[PDB]
């Protein structure tokens, strides 16, 4: 599910006094009047809060997996409309491959975080075919 359109942008969510503000400025500063990239940023921020131990550390493998997952969701939403977009088809298939690679590395290094990631993002890890 997407964030509500009334949610404030990530950059305008900790500014002091944002609750003492007129409705019109709230609309101007919401996801209703921004392109899709802020909504994806909000999704990423929510997942980082929900899954990882340190939401601020973005270089960790779990953070990269979450980022690639939101990107993959974006590609699937895009291809649901542009069925003949071969470039974005390539991008989606590749991104799935590297997310599988990151999941393999996380499994081999940190199993607890791997379980948490797989539960939080609804990812079913599958072992590669032998032939």
């Amino acid at each position: 599910d997407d964030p509500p359109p009334s949610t404030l942008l990530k950059d305008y969510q900790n500014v002091p006094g944002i609750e003492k503000v007129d409705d019109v400025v709230k609309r101007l500063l919401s996801l209703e009047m921004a392109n899709k990239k802020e909504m994806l940023k909000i999704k990423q921020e929510q997942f980082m809060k929900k899954i990882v131990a340190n939401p601020e550390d973005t270089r960790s493998l779990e953070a990269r997996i979450i980022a690639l997952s939101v990107k993959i969701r974006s590609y699937e939403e895009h291809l649901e409309k542009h069925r003949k977009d071969k470039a974005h088809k390539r991008y989606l298939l590749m991104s799935i491959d590297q997310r599988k690679k990151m999941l393999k590395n996380l499994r081999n290094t940190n199993y607890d975080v791997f379980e948490k990631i797989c539960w939080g993002l609804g990812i079913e890890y599958t072992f590669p075919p032998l032939y």
């Binding site: 609309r27 101007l28 209703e32 009047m33 392109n35 899709k36």
Partner: protein, 105 residues
């Protein structure tokens, strides 16, 4: 986001120009826009003859409507401009002020 509507309206008398401006701004607000400013660039001869709604125009009034609209609004507004008969030409662009100056030093 923030958009600018450049509007080329038919060379008409003031009451009808006011009516058309009210109608287009009302459409913008109906599609979810917050209109910021309305600026009149003036009435002037067109750079070239423009055929619209089965009528040939050589003069027109130029207006700018700054606004903030939800992204899905733009396409709809375009269709509406395609139906209004008093508009020779309406074009919606991302507002130039949002594009921030590149640091060419």
């Amino acid at each position: 986001p923030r958009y600018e509507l450049a509007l080329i309206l038919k060379a008409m008398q003031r009451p009808e120009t006011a009516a058309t401006l009210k109608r287009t701004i009302e459409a913008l607000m109906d599609r979810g826009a917050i209109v910021r400013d309305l600026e009149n660039l003036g009435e002037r001869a067109l750079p070239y003859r423009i055929s619209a709604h089965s009528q040939q125009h050589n003069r027109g009034g130029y207006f700018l409507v700054d606004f903030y609209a939800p992204t899905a609004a733009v396409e709809s507004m375009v269709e509406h401009l395609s139906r209004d008969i008093d508009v020779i030409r309406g074009n919606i662009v991302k507002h130039p002020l949002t594009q921030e100056l590149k640091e060419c030093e």
